[PDB]
Ligand binder design. Structure first.
Ligand code: I7B
Lengths: 133, 133
């Protein structure tokens, strides 16, 4: 169970940059972002080998404690036992997740959140640096 | 209230770096480090002009809700309307706080925490970057 942070006060268009170490035995890691632990506009879950998925990013939302429908992504620029940085911005319509090696995707902001105040990391990812601008 | 982070798992000898923006009319700011809001190995409180103090760093501990004996440090290398970084490490005997302009001081480690797991920021300091290394 990894870093939990609150009172982030991230506003639309502002960049949240997260750099960490992907464990050498990595199977899965998670970054959760939202209003609080029950209201997530982004559950970001790269699965190296987990829950039947191989090298697939799965995203979801959580609204008032209820998980939404999982969305699978098309790119996977992560390797076990490496450093990786993710950069996230949002607006009320979409989150934009920028990944290593120039990859990126958008995920709809199902909560239409105008501020992100909560982040939590879990799984095979050791955070080394968080930046807010 | 500003950023609150938990599960930091900062081990002895590891460096926590915190960079932020000091408000142009700053009066004071606080970084609290420890186990939780009731158990702080370091309450670090630069006062530009607050509580009768001028350009003085006030430090203390808090153990089971009880404030310890305050200490006041010798140097004040902070300026309103600037960017400032602090860097903190600890061993069993002391926390070492490294300040802008190369200044550093030690504060006794009065608690027996195996790791620093909690940070909370308050006051006239906007955190821009936190690094765990
Ligand atoms: N400023 C703004 C304008 C529009 Cl139009 C939209 S929307 N409705 O296309 O998502 C969102 C925003 S923001 N930056 O608050 O998320």
């Amino acid at each position: 169970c990894g870093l939990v942070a609150s009172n982030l006060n991230l506003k639309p268009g502002e960049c949240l940059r997260v750099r960490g170490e992907v464990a050498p035995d990595a199977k899965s890691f998670v970054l959760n972002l939202g209003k609080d632990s029950n209201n997530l506009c982004l559950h970001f879950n790269p699965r190296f080998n987990a829950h039947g998925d191989a090298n697939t990013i799965v995203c979801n939302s959580k609204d008032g404690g209820a998980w939404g429908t999982e969305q699978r992504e098309a790119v996977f620029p992560f390797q076990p036992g490496s450093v990786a940085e993710v950069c996230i911005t949002f607006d009320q319509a979409n989150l934009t997740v920028k990944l290593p090696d120039g990859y990126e995707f958008k995920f709809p902001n199902r909560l239409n959140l105008e501020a992100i105040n909560y982040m939590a990391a879990d799984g095979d990812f050791k955070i080394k640096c968080v930046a807010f601008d």
